[PDB]
Enzyme design. Structure first.
Site, PDB file in Angstrom:
ATOM      1  N   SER D 357      75.056 -21.147  14.440  1.00 28.74           N
ATOM      2  CA  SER D 357      75.890 -20.120  15.049  1.00 28.74           C
ATOM      3  C   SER D 357      77.148 -19.990  14.210  1.00 28.74           C
ATOM      4  O   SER D 357      77.945 -20.930  14.132  1.00 28.74           O
ATOM      5  CB  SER D 357      76.244 -20.455  16.493  1.00 28.74           C
ATOM      6  OG  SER D 357      77.098 -19.466  17.037  1.00 28.74           O
ATOM      7  N   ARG D 358      77.325 -18.832  13.586  1.00 30.80           N
ATOM      8  CA  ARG D 358      78.365 -18.673  12.584  1.00 30.80           C
ATOM      9  C   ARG D 358      79.693 -18.231  13.180  1.00 30.80           C
ATOM     10  O   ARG D 358      80.724 -18.326  12.506  1.00 30.80           O
ATOM     11  CB  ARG D 358      77.878 -17.693  11.519  1.00 30.80           C
ATOM     12  CG  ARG D 358      76.530 -18.143  10.971  1.00 30.80           C
ATOM     13  CD  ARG D 358      75.951 -17.239   9.913  1.00 30.80           C
ATOM     14  NE  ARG D 358      76.614 -17.416   8.632  1.00 30.80           N
ATOM     15  CZ  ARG D 358      77.466 -16.541   8.124  1.00 30.80           C
ATOM     16  NH1 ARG D 358      77.761 -15.452   8.810  1.00 30.80           N
ATOM     17  NH2 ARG D 358      78.033 -16.762   6.948  1.00 30.80           N
ATOM     18  N   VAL D 359      79.686 -17.749  14.421  1.00 25.75           N
ATOM     19  CA  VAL D 359      80.920 -17.582  15.180  1.00 25.75           C
ATOM     20  C   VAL D 359      81.340 -18.916  15.786  1.00 25.75           C
ATOM     21  O   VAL D 359      82.539 -19.188  15.924  1.00 25.75           O
ATOM     22  CB  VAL D 359      80.719 -16.491  16.251  1.00 25.75           C
ATOM     23  CG1 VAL D 359      81.963 -16.271  17.098  1.00 25.75           C
ATOM     24  CG2 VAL D 359      80.312 -15.196  15.596  1.00 25.75           C
TER      25      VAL D 359
END
Ligand SMILES: Nc1ncnc2c1ncn2[C@@H]1O[C@H](COP(=O)(O)OP(=O)(O)OP(=O)(O)O)[C@@H](O)[C@H]1O
Ligand SMILES: Nc1ncnc2c1ncn2[C@@H]1O[C@H](COP(=O)(O)OP(=O)(O)O)[C@@H](O)[C@H]1O
Ligand SMILES: [Mg+2]
Ligand SMILES: [Mg+2]
Lengths: 175, 470, 51, 494, 471, 72
Positions: D357-359
């Site tokens: 998950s890049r957020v």
């Protein structure tokens, strides 16, 4: 893919007819070639026959298409030696569609319940010449017993329909 | 001298001018059309010329969406390629492909000069004779993967590792020590992340030195072509006029090639190997050879690279890599460990790490740091399973000095001052070579495992270890 | 049930309406249109001319 | 009835119907070419003589490439195509909520017409770099592996990718079911599915009360590939209608790989040149136009967001295919579902090592960060140390305790079907896991411990749950310890 | 009188040109009937299906029989309708070709019979029925790990010679005898030998006079083999719509539908797609398979055998038909070469029915624990293949020991396979096989040899075979 | 193990039906047991009843080319 090629060929012949000053002669020759090839369909099958030499096929075109002008005959022989002689009626349609815009005349197809008078068609042409932009306008009238009590016109790709549009618009608006 | 539209084929528009009035290749065409009735849409497009067809017809590439175009619409010829404003006006301003400000700080007046997008590369007569090292102040970068002044760098990193913070202190360090403007060019990569990077530009104060060009995934691939050239012609003004050592950041240059492969199938080209355009090496080189260090200034370029599915054999990563001089690989396992910046020391390589460029002492110290960290990344399973008590008293010295080196590779940043309160440091190359040499010799084995954590120099290690009581 | 009533009501309505169209055309045919065809046409040009 | 008919006849005005037309060259396979149509636009609604709509995509010099949006068997060579005068639009409004709808906008569920007043274009530009705001607020899915390890925020697009029968649609339906308390408006876009599968999904949404806020857009396999092509764009247009008003929208794209196959068909029949796997050139641009429209707007643009959950089906775990690596390179993180974990009892089958998950971290609440930052470390240590426990001699007691903690971590992260868990209970059960309150309890009782612990938090205590719901933080780590020990007194180990 | 010439004959594909304004719509049947004027000609009774429109008022068609004999310029009859198949009570106990004509030598159907067109749209959303109840088959893998849904779509995925026609004949023998309704068999591109054997088995066992059989076997040209399944489907649709009756569809090799489309798609002027398949590989199978549904009037439980080419499950024609099926059984050659019959992959075979609210809690626990032990044994095959059974840590040995017993007790003797081996075959109830796998998972039969579980119905039969072996 | 005949088996002359089934059993046991033969001590069945039968089955089922045998 034949209309785009016939447009190029007819535009070349059109620019020749403008720069030469013999546009009426070239137009009459193109109409004569179109009528002669519409009346006889076996001529394309004759010139597609491969055992006939190219010099012999040029002799047949130079013999048959005599009396027409020099660039029309050169166009027919150039289409022969480029193997694009199958699109000569398409060339005639594109060239007449070019010279009708050159004269400023437009063709239209009218449908009415009753055949209209000669003054009403001229009145419709005088109305619609300002809407289209041409100076002269042509009306083709068809008997067409389907539509009732009105006139509809298809000029170009735009239909001015008001004959039976009232009943269809009514049954689309109520339901 | 103003022609009609013949075909609208996706992003590719075919325009026919009058005989003898054709535009040259790469010239910007304009479509400015007001809706004549309710059956039409107001349209403002910019098309660039790509090909010359048979009968006065030109295939073009669109910069925005072609939805709404009517056959027969009038096209304006500008007589020039895409002109983009350059100068001190571009500092702190966010631009699109056409050199128009995306942000609402204002519009640029027509008195400013505008350099064209398409430009030949600098000649062989004009370049620098031998390699100079672009000194960054980052200890992993200055020690193990030295950036040359005028070359190309590959960031191999994802998210959550600290790529943006590394970008921002590169901008800060080159701005305060070299007087170097940076230029960020976002080429087809995640509008949200470009927004985050812009707000961190605003927070760090880094924005006042940076010109920014964004064309993201939403824009058609002609825009995603010309973004990197827009950023590069913004950097070339500062190089060729101010004589500065300019940074030029291209995020994900893979998008610059795949945008070309998206356009070229519709332009009418035969497909090349792996579906990539046939002109892929030349389109890559016409970008990468304008990034050079001439006799006047320099343009060095740190370029993020996304490799699809970690396949290093498809042609577009191969031709991005053939222009690279160094790589810095950002590793999540070092970011979770607390090492900032999380540059993987063993996997990040450089062409400049050679004793004819860095010198003999720097090469020997860097090679010994790589040897002890590679010997440490052979005992990882043994330490994790069998424990520390069982290894040897010769390899535990190796893991001892390896941990002391591995935590001394991290710095305090100037752009991380607002988050931790620590001011941050610019570390020269001689002092970090001296520090790693003194750690390799064994002068600092008595100091603990921390106090190497997040410090600039080795005197800061001594001061922090005295602050810890040791 | 409430939907069913509303859909049947529209359907039936459409059948009556269909009948009404077919006849509308038949009865308009029935009237003598010498006067009407000239009148309509003259109006139509005028009407087209205005729009 | 007849009075309204007489009133509308009295209100009827007769005018001349003007129309730009064009005759058809070719009919076949949902694709038509046509002469004429001189003034049409690219991407325009144009309609045949049957009333069947079409989309004008390719505008060549002598013909128009019309893309038929309905049954083409009534269309013949020689029919005329009528220029509607407007770009391809989608009817949007609040009347679509709770309705199964065509991508053209007609009602499909058969509950009467959909009374919308205004439309939006199906091709709209995404919000720019300046138009957005950073993702900071949670999209709570209810799955603890997602809401703990791969978190999703509002304005984020997350690819949920895996093989068939691994659990993708169940993650979608569970996420949509969890949005009942929130102000989220779900949209489930069913692309290329069997229509009885879509009816099963709609009935499971109606059973859990989820049709009060969701919109189902279906484009089944019997429908032509033109309607499968325009289904995600219609779904995201229906989403951005609420997004540009201030609302928060979840748009689930079930099997965008079937959209890629439909657009491949659409391009091959229009005689466009293929690429790799015969997909056309602008397939990345196809997915990026709809996945960049999912955003979180700034406070000047309204503040509303649109989070997306696209799906991609892989073939035998080949994650390195063309459409999976196109959509992985667009979305803000991935959720990998694997059958290897699915048939080993671990369901939801989220491979949290590969899933990114890049957020992530900005999506979680402040309690979930504190609790899950060591959950990820314990599960990563278990994944690394399980590799040496397959065969061999043995491992010593310390990393066997690590393996026991990781086995109980895996047993915590399992859920049941269509049972979403609120976040204030997720933080409590992962707090009980990570602080060592489960080492007394064997691996085969962790599910029953969690099931009884949620009931204990409901009937006893419950001042902790109000603290986590109001302050979004842990309740000072001592009332938690005495509450968990008071429950461990109650719990009877099998 | 609107009749046309033949322009092009391109394999199975015939171009027909009509006069302007009189073109037939797509999917209409065209007829060629030529009487061989001289000795250089051949009598022709051929029919054509309209597929495309080419422009220049020329129609692109697909032939249903062989085009050997067609001359450019022959006269083509326009029927004004699609291929109308005769349907009703007349089709029961009869065998038909693609055109609805009887090929069973029992007579011909009069012209007064009701006949429905082959081509019609799929049933809408408001008409469908999504009730899930279990069809009991007597096959242990099918009853335990992938229960067949009564009224749903069932797929049999296998390669060549893997056990797929034998399994669909076992499903006919177990289900179609006691169904109490109409069956329809549709042989789409299978052996004409198997069309005769199955007909005589229907005549022997009395399942005929409530079945309708359509054979478009692999000798037929591809234009026939496309429309075979549509002919059998509209025969099923008459019963489930007009009579509201439960219908069984057995379709052997529905892969041959997409393959016969792929053979014609190159000659229809279409560009190729991935793996040589038509671009319309999804919507041609969506116009067929979304039409095989259960409605509020009646249900169709379709059991479809699906060929997997070159044992490649990632091939585009098997991969796009997984999304249509409620329950799939994936036959594997690795299990067929071990002597495990049915060679059903226990892991990759799934069903929508396998849920605790549909089947029961204890069935679900036993099925998921079987799948857990088989997945754990699948994850150990590298260690067993290289290092052997010697280094597993005494619970993995127990997993392997019970999983060999489970993988062999999934295998079963068939009534159909009595002609193969001589063993008479068995029918196992669902509670019996759940009790059996529960007794194996508890470790009750760890003392018996593992070859005692091969091709055995019940665990009482396991014990009597194991004491016949000597244990 | 890999060679099947479906429609055959109903073709044999009712003597081969009586005789060849245990031939198939013996040859299948020999071909699946010979791969794990040379290891350890042989069991009382695997010493003579299976391997020393299957070796004779293999030696029976070999022929020379262009010498077909009548079925009797
Ligand atoms: N906790 C869980 N999460 C996900 N799936 C579960 C869970 N528990 C049981 N299942 C089962 O897993 C199956 C997953 O089917 P699902 O509807 O997710 O299919 P899919 O993954 O979308 O792929 P396809 O639709 O191609 O089968 C369901 O039948 C469901 O019964
Ligand atoms: N239950 C079974 N028992 C023994 N042999 C079987 C069984 N099922 C299939 N086989 C063998 O596997 C082969 C599969 O052929 P079959 O299933 O008839 O056609 P297909 O080619 O469609 O698989 C057959 O030759 C048969 O000998
Ligand atoms: Mg699904
Ligand atoms: Mg078979």
């Amino acid at each position: 893919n034949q209309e785009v090629i016939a447009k190029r060929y007819a535009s070349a012949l059109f620019q020749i007819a403008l720069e030469q000053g013999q546009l009426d002669r070239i137009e009459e020759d193109v109409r004569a070639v179109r009528q002669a090839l519409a009346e006889n369909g076996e001529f394309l099958s004759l010139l597609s026959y491969p055992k006939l030499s190219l010099d012999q096929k040029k002799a047949l075109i130079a013999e048959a298409f005599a009396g027409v002008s020099t660039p029309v005959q050169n166009t027919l022989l150039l289409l022969l030696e480029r193997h694009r002689f199958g699109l000569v009626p398409e060339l005639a349609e594109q060239f007449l569609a070019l010279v009708d815009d050159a004269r400023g005349i437009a063709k239209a197809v009218a449908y009415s319940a009753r055949p209209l008078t000669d003054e009403e068609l001229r009145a419709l042409s005088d109305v619609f010449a300002q809407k289209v932009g041409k100076q002269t306008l042509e009306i083709e009238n068809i008997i067409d017993p389907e539509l009732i009590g009105g006139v509809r016109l298809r000029i170009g790709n735009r239909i001015y329909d008001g004959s039976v549009s009232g009943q269809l618009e009514r049954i689309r608006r109520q339901l | 001298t103003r022609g009609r539209v013949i075909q609208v084929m996706g992003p590719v528009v075919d325009v026919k001018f009058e005989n003898g009035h054709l535009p040259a290749i790469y010239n910007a065409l304009k479509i400015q059309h007001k809706a004549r009735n309710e059956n039409e849409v107001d349209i403002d497009l910019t098309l660039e010329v790509a090909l010359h067809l048979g009968d006065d017809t030109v295939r073009t590439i669109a910069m925005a969406s072609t939805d709404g175009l009517i056959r027969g619409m009038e096209v304006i010829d500008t007589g020039a390629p895409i002109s983009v404003p350059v100068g001190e006006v571009t500092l702190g301003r966010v631009f699109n492909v056409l050199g128009e400000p995306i942000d609402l700080e204002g519009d640029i007046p027509a008195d400013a000069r505008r350099d064209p997008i398409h430009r030949p590369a600098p000649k062989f007569e004009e370049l620098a004779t031998e390699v100079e090292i672009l000194e960054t102040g980052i200890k992993v970068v200055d020690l193990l993967a030295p950036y040359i002044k005028g070359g190309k760098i590959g960031l191999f990193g994802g998210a959550g590792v600290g790529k943006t913070v590394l970008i921002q202190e590169l901008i800060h360090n080159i701005a305060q020590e070299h007087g170097g403007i940076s230029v960020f060019a976002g080429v087809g990569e995640r509008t949200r992340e470009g927004n985050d990077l812009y707000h961190e530009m605003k927070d760090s104060g880094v924005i006042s030195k940076t010109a920014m060009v964004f064309g993201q995934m939403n824009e058609p691939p002609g825009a995603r072509m010309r973004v990197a050239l827009t950023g590069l012609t913004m950097a070339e003004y500062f190089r060729d006029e101010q004589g500065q050592d300019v940074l030029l950041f291209i995020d994900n240059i893979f998008r610059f090639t795949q945008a070309g492969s998206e356009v070229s199938a519709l332009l009418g080209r035969m497909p090349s190997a792996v579906g990539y355009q046939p002109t892929l090496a030349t389109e890559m080189g016409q970008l990468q050879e304008r990034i050079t260090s001439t006799a006047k200034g320099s343009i060095t370029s740190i370029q993020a690279i996304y490799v699809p599915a970690d396949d290093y054999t498809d042609p577009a990563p191969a031709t991005t890599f053939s222009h690279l001089d160094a790589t810095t690989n950002l590793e999540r396992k070092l970011a979770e460990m607390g090492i900032y910046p999380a540059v993987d020391p063993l996997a990040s390589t450089s062409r400049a790490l050679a004793p004819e460029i860095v010198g003999e002492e720097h090469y020997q110290v860097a090679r010994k740091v790589q040897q002890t960290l590679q010997r440490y990344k052979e005992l990882q399973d043994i330490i994790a399973i069998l424990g520390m008590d069982e290894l040897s008293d010769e390899d535990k010295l190796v893991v001892h000095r390896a941990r002391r080196i591995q935590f001394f590779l991290s710095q305090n940043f100037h752009v991380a001052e607002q988050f931790t309160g620590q001011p941050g440091s610019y570390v020269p190359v001689k002092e970090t070579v001296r520090g790693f040499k003194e750690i390799l010799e064994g002068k600092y084995d008595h100091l603990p495992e921390d106090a190497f954590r997040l410090v600039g120099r080795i005197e800061e290690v001594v001061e922090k270890a005295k602050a810890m009581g040791v | 049930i409430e939907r069913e009533k509303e859909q049947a009501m529209a359907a039936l309505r459409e059948q009556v309406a269909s009948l009404s169209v077919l006849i509308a055309s038949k009865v308009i045919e029935k009237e003598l249109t010498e006067q009407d065809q000239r009148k309509l046409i003259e109006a139509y040009i005028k009407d087209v001319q205005e729009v | 009835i007849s009075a309204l008919i007489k009133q509308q006849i009295e209100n009827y005005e007769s005018q001349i119907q003007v129309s730009d037309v064009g005759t058809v060259i070719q009919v076949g396979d949902g694709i038509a070419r046509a002469h004429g149509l001189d003034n049409v636009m690219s991407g325009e609604l144009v309609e045949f003589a049957n009333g069947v709509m079409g989309m004008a995509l390719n505008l060549e010099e002598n013909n128009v490439g019309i893309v038929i949006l309905g049954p083409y068997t009534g269309i013949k060579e020689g029919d005329e195509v009528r220029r509607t005068g407007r770009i391809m639009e989608v009817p949007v409004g609040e009347a679509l909520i709770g309705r199964v709808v065509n991508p053209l906008g007609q009602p499909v569920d058969g509950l009467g017409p959909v009374e919308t007043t205004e439309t939006r274009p199906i091709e709209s530009p995404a919000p720019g770099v300046m138009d957005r705001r950073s993702v900071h607020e949670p999209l709570q899915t209810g799955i603890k592996a997602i809401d703990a390890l791969v978190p999703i925020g509002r304005g984020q697009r997350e690819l949920i990718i895996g093989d068939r029968q691994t659990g993708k649609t169940s993650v979608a339906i569970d996420t949509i079911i969890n949005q009942k308390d929130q102000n989220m408006i779900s949209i489930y876009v069913a692309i290329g599915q069997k229509e009885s599968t879509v009816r099963t999904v709609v009935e499971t949404l109606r059973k859990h009360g989820a049709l009060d806020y969701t919109i189902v857009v279906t484009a089944s396999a019997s429908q032509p590939a033109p309607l499968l092509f325009l289904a995600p764009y219609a779904g995201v247009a229906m989403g951005e209608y609420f997004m540009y008003k201030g609302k928060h929208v979840l748009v689930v794209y079930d099997d965008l790989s079937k959209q890629a196959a439909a657009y491949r068909e659409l391009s091959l029949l229009l005689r466009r040149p293929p690429g790799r796997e015969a997909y056309p050139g602008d397939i990345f641009y196809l997915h990026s136009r709809l996945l960049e429209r999912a955003a979180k707007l700034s406070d000047a643009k309204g503040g509303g967001s649109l989070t997306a959950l696209p799906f991609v089906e892989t073939q035998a775990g080949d994650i390195s295919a063309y459409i999976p690596t196109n959509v992985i390179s667009i979305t803000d993180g991935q959720i990998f579902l694997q059958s290897d974990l699915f048939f080993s009892g671990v369901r939801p089958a989220i491979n949290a090592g590969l899933s990114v998950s890049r957020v992530g971290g900005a999506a979680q609440i402040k309690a979930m960060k504190k609790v899950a930052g060591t959950l990820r470390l314990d599960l990563a240590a278990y994944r690394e140390l399980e590799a040496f426990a397959q065969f061999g001699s043995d491992l010593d007691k310390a990393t066997q305790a690590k393996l026991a903690r990781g086995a109980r971590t895996v047993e915590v992260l399992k859920q049941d079907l269509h049972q979403p868990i609120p976040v204030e209970k997720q933080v409590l059960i992962i707090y009980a896991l990570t602080r060592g309150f489960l080492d007394d309890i064997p691996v085969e009782d962790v599910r029953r411990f969690e099931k009884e612990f949620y009931l204990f938090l409901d009937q006893n205590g419950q001042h902790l749950l109000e603290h986590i719901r109001t302050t979004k933080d842990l309740p000072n780590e001592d009332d938690l310890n005495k509450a968990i020990e008071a429950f461990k007194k109650t719990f009877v180990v099998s």
